[PDB]
Design a protein around this ligand. Sequence first.
Ligand code: FES
Ligand code: FES
Ligand code: FES
Ligand SMILES: [Mg+2]
Ligand SMILES: [Mg+2]
Ligand SMILES: [Mg+2]
Lengths: 575, 575, 575
Amino acid sequence: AEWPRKLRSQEWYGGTSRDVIYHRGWLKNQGYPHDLFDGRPVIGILNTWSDMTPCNGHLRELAEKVKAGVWEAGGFPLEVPVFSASENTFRPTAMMYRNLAALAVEEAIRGQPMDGCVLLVGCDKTTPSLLMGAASCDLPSIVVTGGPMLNGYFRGERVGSGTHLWKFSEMVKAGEMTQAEFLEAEASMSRSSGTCNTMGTASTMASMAEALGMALSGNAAIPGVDSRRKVMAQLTGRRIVQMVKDDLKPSEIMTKQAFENAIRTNAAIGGSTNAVIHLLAIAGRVGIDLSLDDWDRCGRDVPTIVNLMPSGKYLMEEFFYAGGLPVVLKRLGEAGLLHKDALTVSGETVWDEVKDVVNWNEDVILPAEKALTSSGGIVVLRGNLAPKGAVLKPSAASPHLLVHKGRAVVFEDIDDYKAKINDDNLDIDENCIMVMKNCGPKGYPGMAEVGNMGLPPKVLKKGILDMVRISDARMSGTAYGTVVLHTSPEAAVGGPLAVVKNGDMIELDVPNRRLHLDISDEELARRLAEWQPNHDLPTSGYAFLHQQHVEGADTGADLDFLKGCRGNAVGKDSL
Amino acid sequence: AEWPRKLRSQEWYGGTSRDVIYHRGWLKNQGYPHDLFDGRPVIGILNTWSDMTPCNGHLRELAEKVKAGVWEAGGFPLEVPVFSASENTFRPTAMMYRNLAALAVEEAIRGQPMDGCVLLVGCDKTTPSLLMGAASCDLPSIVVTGGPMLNGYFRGERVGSGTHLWKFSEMVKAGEMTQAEFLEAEASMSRSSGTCNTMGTASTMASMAEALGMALSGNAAIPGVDSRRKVMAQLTGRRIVQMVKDDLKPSEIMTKQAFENAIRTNAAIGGSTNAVIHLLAIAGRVGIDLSLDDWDRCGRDVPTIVNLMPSGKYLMEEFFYAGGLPVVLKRLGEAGLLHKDALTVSGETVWDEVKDVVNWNEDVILPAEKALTSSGGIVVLRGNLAPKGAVLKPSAASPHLLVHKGRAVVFEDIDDYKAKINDDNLDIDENCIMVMKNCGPKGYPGMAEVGNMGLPPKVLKKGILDMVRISDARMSGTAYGTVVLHTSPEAAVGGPLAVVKNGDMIELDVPNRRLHLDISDEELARRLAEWQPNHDLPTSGYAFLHQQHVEGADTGADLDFLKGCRGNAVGKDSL
Amino acid sequence: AEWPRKLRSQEWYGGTSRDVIYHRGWLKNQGYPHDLFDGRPVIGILNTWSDMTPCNGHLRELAEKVKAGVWEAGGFPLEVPVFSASENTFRPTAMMYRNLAALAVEEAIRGQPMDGCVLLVGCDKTTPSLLMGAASCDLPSIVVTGGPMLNGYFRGERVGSGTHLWKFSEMVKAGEMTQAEFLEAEASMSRSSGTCNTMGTASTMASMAEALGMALSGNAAIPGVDSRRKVMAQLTGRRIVQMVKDDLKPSEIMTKQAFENAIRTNAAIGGSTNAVIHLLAIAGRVGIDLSLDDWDRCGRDVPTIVNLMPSGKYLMEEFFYAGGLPVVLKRLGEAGLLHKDALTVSGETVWDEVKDVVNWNEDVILPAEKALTSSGGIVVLRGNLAPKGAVLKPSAASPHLLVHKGRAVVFEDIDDYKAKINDDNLDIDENCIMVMKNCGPKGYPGMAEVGNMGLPPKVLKKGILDMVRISDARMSGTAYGTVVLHTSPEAAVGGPLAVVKNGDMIELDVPNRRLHLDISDEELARRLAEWQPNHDLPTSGYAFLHQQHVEGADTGADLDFLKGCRGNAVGKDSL
Ligand code: FES
Ligand code: FES
Ligand code: FES
Ligand SMILES: [Mg+2]
Ligand SMILES: [Mg+2]
Ligand SMILES: [Mg+2]
């Protein structure tokens, strides 16, 4: 596009009408030179900082670095806080507030005199909520990630965010650790400012951001407190001004190719199962046709080569010193698995960004023959038990359980699980299949990370730590096990998983992508004909709104009316 | 000056040596793009903010604005706290520490990789101490003034910072007010963030710096919380980068013409007497030839026209709304009393910055025919009693006492004064002459603002509020009365003032600039013969340093070994 | 100590006089409830933060954490920036300004209404300068250390702060490495906020302050960006308030035993040679008699068990995770080498603080029988060549060189060596004694860190990296080799070292603490008798102050008029 030209902020700040004396005159009450309003690019810095989002606790400092970049680059920077859907404070689950955050972000961008956006995110759900909202305006935008925490440690041994909460609490159930030992691990578990240091949802959506092209190369793995995270922020501030002038919009970056790059990247890094739901959501805002079948297709025969927990051994620091995601993207290109000419916010293709990087540790970023799995992509299972799809993370499942048939042990909701799971009389053993209902988008409500249900203590004491588990919930990106997730449609809407009865037999078969309830079709229609809701039914509030409008996990669990891209047209004026 | 060129900051940050890797490499630990060390101007922003300098309490917010401007102009901003000699916390008196703060500032500038300086100041002694430090280096520098507080308000009346502290405290012991009522005025007295709102030292020094050309036009009177003060700071951050490229140095702005512009401006505004001391010290560092007589000469027949406490009626807000110092300066050029071609930090002559401005309240900036005084300049008296000079602020004195003769009532030090003044048995009437010694630079120590002695209560209860007062002390810029100050040599070093005796007659003659002790030259000669120095001289500490090196107030009371300009040659390196 | 009682801040802020109405009314312009002036402890938070002290980059965040603690404990926190003698910026050498900064710190304490102090330090010379300053007032004070940077890395390997600086630049001279390779490591060398991460001066002075009891247990090794740094700062804020109420003064803490504890801790951790100078300076302000001989006696037979560069293999991170200084202090006590009853700022004895900690890594905090050295204490050599003492750090020297005789190669000043060192025709071998003069306190001036002269490139290429080097300079605490330092008296004040000529025989016998010039008493007699002092002594500014008053390195290189403790009596009032 051509420059100079009238950007949308001049609808507020250019000219001489009483309307612009009002807008420009009132903002000057903070000491701004008059020429800031001359039509140079006005940059919104959307900031999800918050004392109650501790994973992003340093993003105010990151914001100052972005500002200096905009100043240098000739723009007018302005910081705008936005909804921070913090993973560790929000109950019933931060997943419930992702759409709300996206709503507020979209309105905050379109409603106000900003020409381009910088999106400062970190904790799990902040990255997709802000990308969803900016995609619905399609103004030039760029991601700055806060970064992982440093390695935690306990008893001279490496500890990873989340993954060891599962390990320790199971160990405690198995009699291999006391709750007091667990407590002492607390102080050194999260011990710098940043996001979970395993390959959880935070680290995955940072990789997805980088691999879509929405952040400068290297953005994903730089530790939160590392000097170069602040360099990257300043340089992002410089770039965005230039991006506005050129008019490099999100819709030119996140192409079908870009989404396929991010999908094969999730296989390579052992990405979290929530990337499936978020990438779908984000694509539904950009306007790209993207389905569960693209996920399954693209991740097939892509080895998981990044050696981090929960699938592997190390944490985010090692991955960063190994060279980070640009080394994964070079590999994907080297193996012919990359759209090399995808565009990035830098204005270079992904290949031209990464072509010359170096793997500094083949124990962290593995050679293709020593991968954790030769087909690392998440698998989509279908069948009468999950007619709209269900997913599993192969890089952290048990091989002997990937095909398995056992007797169903049913929990009607999460409170049903917590009541029975420790009962020593619970009729369950290691061959059984644990099934849980009503933990989906409408059922939980919010689709909580509870599908990685803990094992019966009496199985754990035989030294068995895995079992086939099925639910319509999610699990943490930090979790592991042979867990079948996102079962669609969810029970709370009369999907077949609502009618599963104890004793029923179920067949899992990953190679044939098959999830089967072994009852006749007559018995199924009969059970389903008697379905009813067995979950909470809100009468008002945002909970009501969510209950009425949230789609299923198989499409991204967006709100139906919030789908797609609504543009950035300035409204009528306010006076 | 050649641009581009290698600036002194490149001695630390330019090239590929082991030494440059150390220096550049370490600063980089804060997140700085490598191109910031490529030779752009590095701008040190010297901040006198401290939680214990309340008058300067908003300087952090101002420093951020200076940084923004620097980034804009393409320099490299680095904030650098420096000693803040707060007038209302430091005891025995901030004056003692003025030189200490100029020493620290001078070394902080030369010892580190600044190419130009920004001087963030406010409270009384911060302005002179930072200007003294920078003059001794002569790197491109520029001033940002903190700004005066809003008006105080007690019982619907205007209350002024300082001036009403003396008015109220004398009314208390006159029997016209109670301390209880004095205390009620407290919280509405100093009720915004900034300096004293009268025409005191901070308002005078702010004007001095503008009048010298060391600060952008309009700097002195903007209220501290007025949004146009932050605008001023941002524009100053832009322009310091350009002065470094151009090499606009302090020696080039503070010429002799500049200093006379300053002296004539001080008479026009009825400025603080401390302006005399501070300005002699500053010219002491630039190396300009400036003397007491220059002061008497230049303020002669310059009418005081700024109707502000303590000479006049209103406060700094009123001054700012009428037009601030630019009006005053223009009137000086219209009157033939301005060096119109003296150059300023802006690159323009002073006349060019002021010649078009508009006086918006002649009740505040008075026309010459209504001037508070016809000869507004501070006067210098000489005579056997002050061989090296004493000063008096006529625009806040009583005309009928400017020629007076009377009986000496003599106080040996400040304890003796406090011990005697309120004694109704003291032989004193309104026609006597109050004399105090041992309050000078070495005597007090530090030359405290105690020269405006309170009158004896019994005189005050006659409705009388002015008597002639002589001492070696200073007085606040906010004080008033017919007060003879800065008497040199001070008693502590054996000046004539030391041998004045109760009952001696003294003659004050201001038109003839005479201050005469009426005793025979043989009698004064022998009285001095028995003079002995003070006891309990400080044997160690800064107090020791000050006792050995401070000069008399007749020259600026700098330290003898700190006079002059030592330049800005980079030192040897530390490895 | 009685509580409640009148603290010294009430001299400014208690009661009803106009003097107090001025002090208290003016600070209230920043918005403080009246009751904050009720006499609760006013805590001065002395901050050495500065954009030009990048090693202390985060101390503003730490200051806020301290304030919060002071609020919680019921005090009135006020932050006061103070001189910041940044090692990586100041030139000629930050050591020149260590006393300047102590001067400022002292006056800012006694001159303002603070009842207690928190010292926020990091970079080498900040820790000692605020400790000297606070020692000369004796108000209750407590230290907060910034903390070290995270490990650096190059080519997947660990790089140490400063230590790898000397290492790499010597490999370039010996042909094993290019300047351009050197430059690549720079971006990953200093990669988080904090101090040098070897066992250098900052690490050592932080350890000395914990060893002294002047800082809370664990204070020393917590990295800058580690979340327990912020906890410690808030815990310190709480504690100082109580210290003021109890009146726990530094003279109560920094006892002879406490200094012994510090000297022995230095040996155990292989600390910097600069601790010898800084500890004596600090003792000179407290009034405790302490000598170079105390040093030699106390470190004898104390093995260095901390296996960090430059002496060992690892960095501060690993030291932190092994258990830090508490584990070291604990071991001294287990070996009978600890004053277990020395009292700390917490009101507990050191042994009571550390007696239960756990060594979490025997490779980093070694067992005695695996120590780097069995007698790790710094050694004090005497002899005709250093009649007043010289020092050497055994834990990082070559043992075959601790008893050696050789021909002297004499550089008369740092410019002399800089011109001679890389000339292949320089007559020198791996058995000569590199001697260099005129780098002492007065000579450099400021006693730069240059005693560890880079070897002759032709020797380095034979694969030799160590030679006996002797001077009156310091070296970096990150330095290694068989280096003799602080040779007293210095050459510039006519000490023997001044007169060595090439070819003189010098003997170094460390086990016998002897350093000998092999010439006749008469020939040395004659040599000195015709010695002239340096020409071009500085005649103004701080350089003159320094030339006139700095004592020798053998007493800590204070200024003579600053030694001792002048207390905290509030001065006369300013009005
Ligand atoms: S809890 Fe915030 S990233 Fe996991
Ligand atoms: S006390 Fe600060 S300007 Fe008067
Ligand atoms: S340069 Fe600051 S600790 Fe080394
Ligand atoms: Mg999550
Ligand atoms: Mg004053
Ligand atoms: Mg050092």
